[PDB]
Amino acid sequence: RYSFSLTTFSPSGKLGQIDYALTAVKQGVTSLGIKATNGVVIATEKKSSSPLAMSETLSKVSLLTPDIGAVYSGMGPDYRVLVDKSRKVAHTSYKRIYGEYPPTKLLVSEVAKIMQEATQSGGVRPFGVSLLIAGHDEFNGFSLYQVDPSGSYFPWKATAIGKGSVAAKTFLEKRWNDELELEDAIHIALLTLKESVEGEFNGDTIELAIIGDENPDLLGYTGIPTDKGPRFRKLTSQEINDRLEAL
Amino acid sequence: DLSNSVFSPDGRNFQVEYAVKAVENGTTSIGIKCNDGVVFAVEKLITSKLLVPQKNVKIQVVDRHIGCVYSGLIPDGRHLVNRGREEAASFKKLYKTPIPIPAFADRLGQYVQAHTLYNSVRPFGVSTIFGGVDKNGAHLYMLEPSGSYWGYKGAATGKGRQSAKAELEKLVDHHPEGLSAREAVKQAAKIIYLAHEDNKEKDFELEISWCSLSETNGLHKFVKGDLLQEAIDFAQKEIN
Amino acid sequence: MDIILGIRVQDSVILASSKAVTRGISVLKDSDDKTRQLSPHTLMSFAGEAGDTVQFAEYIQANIQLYSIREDYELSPQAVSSFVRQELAKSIRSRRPYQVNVLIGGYDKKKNKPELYQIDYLGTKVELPYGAHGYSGFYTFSLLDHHYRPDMTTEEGLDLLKLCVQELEKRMPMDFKGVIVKIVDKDGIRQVDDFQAQ
Amino acid sequence: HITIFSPEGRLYQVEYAFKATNQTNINSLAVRGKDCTVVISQKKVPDKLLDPTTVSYIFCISRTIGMVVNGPIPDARNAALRAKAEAAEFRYKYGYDMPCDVLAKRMANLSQIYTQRAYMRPLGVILTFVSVDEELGPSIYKTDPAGYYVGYKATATGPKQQEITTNLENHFKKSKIDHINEESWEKVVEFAITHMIDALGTEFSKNDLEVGVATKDKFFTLSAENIEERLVAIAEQD
Amino acid sequence: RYDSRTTIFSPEGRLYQVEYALESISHAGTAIGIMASDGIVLAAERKVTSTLLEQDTSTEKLYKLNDKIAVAVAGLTADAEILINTARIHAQNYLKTYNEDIPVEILVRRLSDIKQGYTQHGGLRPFGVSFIYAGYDDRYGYQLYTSNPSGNYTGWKAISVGANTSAAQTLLQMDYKDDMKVDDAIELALKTLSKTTDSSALTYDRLEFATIRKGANDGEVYQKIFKPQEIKDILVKTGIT
Amino acid sequence: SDPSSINGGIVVAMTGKDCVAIACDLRLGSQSLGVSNKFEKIFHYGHVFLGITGLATDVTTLNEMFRYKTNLYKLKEERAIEPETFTQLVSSSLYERRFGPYFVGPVVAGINSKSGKPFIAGFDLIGCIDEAKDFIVSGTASDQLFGMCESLYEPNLEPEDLFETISQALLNAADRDALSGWGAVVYIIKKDEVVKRYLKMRQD
Amino acid sequence: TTIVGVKFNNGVVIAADTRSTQGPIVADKNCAKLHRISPKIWCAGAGTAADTEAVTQLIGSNIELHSLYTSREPRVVSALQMLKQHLFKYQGHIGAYLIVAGVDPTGSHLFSIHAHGSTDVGYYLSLGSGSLAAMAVLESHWKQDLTKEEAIKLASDAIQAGIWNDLGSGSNVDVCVMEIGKDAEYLRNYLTPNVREEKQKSYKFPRGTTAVLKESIVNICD
Amino acid sequence: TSIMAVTFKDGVILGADSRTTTGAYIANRVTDKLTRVHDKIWCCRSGSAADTQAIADIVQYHLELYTSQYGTPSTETAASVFKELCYENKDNLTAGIIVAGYDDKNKGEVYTIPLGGSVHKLPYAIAGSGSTFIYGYCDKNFRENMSKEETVDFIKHSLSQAIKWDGSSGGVIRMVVLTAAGVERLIFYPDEYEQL
Ligand SMILES: [Mg+2]
Ligand SMILES: [Mg+2]
């Protein structure tokens, strides 16, 4: 007990609820992401309730824009709906004003703007999820971002959130240099993800995607020069376990 | 346990129980689905000799084909009826065809429903019995404070519900083919008397209504007059 | 329409504005000042729709004076006219536009130079050496194009203007009942009240 | 107590909500066919004064989507209605009939929203939606009060969950596929009742149960009579 | 009447709710701003550290508010961004209306007035930020302003906020000649700043800077938010490895 | 009863090999009566250029509105607005007021600081985009401009020549249009440097 | 304004010219009346230009948001219904007639929507001013089951009809193709019949012909 | 425009042309003027295009939603739904619309919701641009209920002459058979009706 529960200043300055929200975070599933000079990678464990649920119908790394995807750790549901609105705001407040899609930084901030609302206001509990948004845009290049329920956000090189963060954040700290190419990262991701598991380690039980390069195939159309293709790539169950070879 | 919205450590809404608790405490009401149509009856309690008889009606019609009665908190009952009245008349204006009893209940159930969702409001303190006809026969249901209702062969609430219950039990088996429209009334007349024996020191006035394509003619009419008398006397003999 | 003139000179500005008021047939007042000092060094002449006119002017005035004591610092001719244009700009697409034209004369103290802005009811502004709303320009603009020099003394200006007037009288159908003239300079505002005996 | 975070971020009203779903006392199971889908639920009629027609925990949402719910009848009829209309509004606003998996989304979405903004208490019911859409065929998705859905190759809701479950699980490690090999529904039906009887240490008459079948775009509730005939079917063959 | 609610008044006319927030400041990175008869300086020490964090294609302490005005944050990250945004907008309405640059005094005021707003109504908590405003307008020239969450603003000769700003404060009181040209200040900035640190020593990465200056050769005002390099360097100039 | 035709003015732009050009007249006046000869229809937001014809206040209001927004863009994005980007914007902006349209005729042109590609666009009062690779004309004497441009545009001129061409195109069409004139000005946009020039013309 | 669409045995094709008028004047010699709603669903639109564009932009914009959320795929009639519900909600005030066409996980599709909310369907539709010439062409050379080659050949030869006999249309031809299994190819200017002949004289002026009164070097950044 | 619906012994069947004209020009000479709202409930649209089209969409919605809770709806239950829409907005609507549906119990019913909103249950109704010349035939050559094939002719010849004197209405004929059996989709090519 304290002057905690409610949206108001504790004697020092600590804002109440917020911290307990950052608790549903720390308790949640383990997830990471690495920015790597020519690509960026985001991943998280897919701990199945039971083997009767075809977990193959629930994305954890989701597509925000054909240049940006993100991921979470915490309250499943908060992430599901947070995303859809997040997608719309990337439209209504950007694409429909400009004709194109928004850079990483801004979309994040825009998501943060919403993460904000839930706070400054009694009658509404904030979100129990921290997001790892990775992206790219023609002028700022590759980006990595974290977003807490407290609205705030930071720019990372790589990191983790959830149960196995204290640990992972240390393993990653060791294994990082500024010249690593994507496949290096991809590889490195798994090896961190390695420890942080309790269940399995096959394909269908690991959710990972990455921002890489244009996929002229995926479009569906051809005839327009400047319109070349999404960079967001959700690796599927297959492509994975194969990379389990070089450990 | 004190607010209306909240749940107990193992999923329970107490305010609704008390709601139920007050529904029981009030007078007793019943209803019976027979051959074609239905029959209702309630228990007006004459507390003094200064009450004009044949007066304060507790039973109400809806549209021109739905009987309706209840017990527990009287104003709550009346209120609920109004909503049902709009819904009916609005629907009617919209689809032309008088409202199907089956759905009607829901419209009501959905409304009683709401008053279990927010804390700022008070749960409905009445159990309600009703029915009527249409194309595909007559129906009869019974709505409680929880909002949950169903279709019964006959219903009962208020003070002594068991009396009329085991009483309704019998009828089922000896007349497993629906009791006669006529006999339905006079029988209801009795089932009440029997269930009254709690307010025994205090006299009372029985009220009855019914529906039937043969008797009422699709409509809901107040059982008053000649058939009303004999239906009492009928009860008065078996009253021994 | 009425008469609204203005001319920027050396270290001042001059505003002319007819005096008569008409209601269809008869002429009510004929000694009416169509002016409204906004601040110690800013001033505004105007002509427009009967009601629209006098309301808007005072309203603009209000805001300014407000700003000027709030801040305690005075607002620049430039900025003032910007605001006026703002208001009209909105006014024109409002459920009901204030049909009013104006001239704004002020002495920008920081630059130590006199500025003059002409602005129609549509929200059309322009810094000018001199101007006149409505039909007023037609009759005079030439004489100004002719004799005007940026260096003219305050007196030089009056003579010019005086001549423009004599013309407006001579070829204008309407009887404007003369003019009230006023000067804005480093000293502030004063009225050439003498233009009756002059 | 109330709807805003615990000290370990787990706001119990949502947790409490669950027990109540269960508390009703009925068992709901569901499995996929190959060109059909099926759900089992018990139909315990105590009061000898009611009417079994009026009883049920399965309703016809759409021309092809049905729904079963282990939970308190009042709250169910609600969920029933909203959902029932979301699809009604959808077909209109978009040109094509709304699939299983989706409804369950706005549905979970809806229950999430409530929960976070506080505009009402969550309904204490778990909805189990069924049908077959020509994009993913035999579909089965479930939703809970803590606003959340997912997929099942065959599921169960009830006081005795894991029992009904484990059986199927074992029957699945062997059948090895992720559904029920068989062409006729009658036959699948038979199969589930089978896998439930065995799973309760109990027997059911022709009214003690409740079942539904999702076909090639023509969802229908199993009625009293036809229901019995499957018990005929699965008596000797056992 | 104790702690809770902002709409409450303690028996002695105190608004605790505020006094906590107004104090919550003592948790943020040490930001400093100094005035010179030729330029204004904004110095700041970063926080939230680890080893896996960029900061180059971003910042979170020094924000440019107007081509003529700049601010140093020290509070809730989430809060700041909201005000920073509406502070930018309003400043532009001033421009769009008067077609002129918005005066610093005015801008500071309006903001202090929103912070104050949240200080008196139920259903909302005050912002937990503190700002060092630095800018110029031809009305009153160069100006250094500050404001707390209590909604009070202040004209300062040279100020600091955040952590150890009582310690850091006094160091300033010593060395400061009113005319003190800019470089002596930029220098002084670090001197003051170093002295008040829990890091083994002052490393460029964990640090933010910017300055304001104007003249005859520019005819107008130019401000610079220093990029990663310039810093790593000037640091050396003040004698740091 | 046409608004666009009340104040007067024209604007024209062309693309040269590695550069662009845009010029406009100077006149501003209510129908017959000429009022100003110092009214410019071309401004910019950093390295981006906009020429606007049509109704005077609406012109001014637009400039302000755009100056406003570009400042706010460059701020949150730490980079100046790009041409192609601006276009798509001014486009949507015009439309947001599609039932109380602004009576104007904009024309955008510039040089993309990444690709280095010259750019030009034109629009109707509601934001319909006219992407062109040679020239854009808007204003009173629209028709007279197409007559000039069609003869004079030559794919890829040298900046020094392009100037001479556009100057003459503008200059001459302006004399057959009664509502445009009283001076003009032409800008020449190179990768870096930019040259502003006023030219001599009939003052009638 | 002159456009058409014709579906064949495994898809559908829509084509439109490239000229935009303005009363008697030619505004754009090269405009794309063919816009993308989604990868497989595209539109061609006539009448009021700014209307036709912005509207598809809008719809394309939402349909994207939809598919994402639904994790399925864009149905053609989804786009149609979206368009005409909004389209008519503004009783005519938004002149935009168009041939909506694409392919969904259930077949090839082709429709035509009027500016008021009217929608039709057939095997070939023409909208625009020269809708009559291009109609007459299709109403003599059309037979059920045409191929990628037969259909294409036709569509482009219908557009050609308007380009010549109707004033309000001209310059080049724009084409786009959707095949029931394959992708979609945007062929900007499949044809180029109208091309200006080389001019007679060279009109470049000798440097220094234009009189200048002043000059300088304008500012840009801070 | 040229539509109608006729009742008989096995129920009712409604038919109409395909011709739709913008001015003196044929927009789409192959229109599906007969529209489905429910399985055993359809309608034929008259007058305005855009309007009639949208009305239906809405109705189709109401009904397809009615059923999901109140069981299967009547033919009268459907008319009233158009009554509301047509009436409320009589000022921005142009619709001649004829409704028809069948139910085993009350056989098939025919209701006409002409312009204004006035509703009518008649033996059979006829609306549309060219209804004007079949007031002679129809009424005169009308026996009380007929046979499946027997009736198909009223439709056939009523529709035939209407093309013969009213250009704004033509194309092919299309019928929709609503019976106990179910729905049957008819179509009678040109060279046929003309011969008669
Ligand atoms: Mg509540
Ligand atoms: Mg023009």
Ligand SMILES: [Mg+2]
């Ligand atoms: Mg001229």
Ligand SMILES: [Mg+2]
């Ligand atoms: Mg005909």
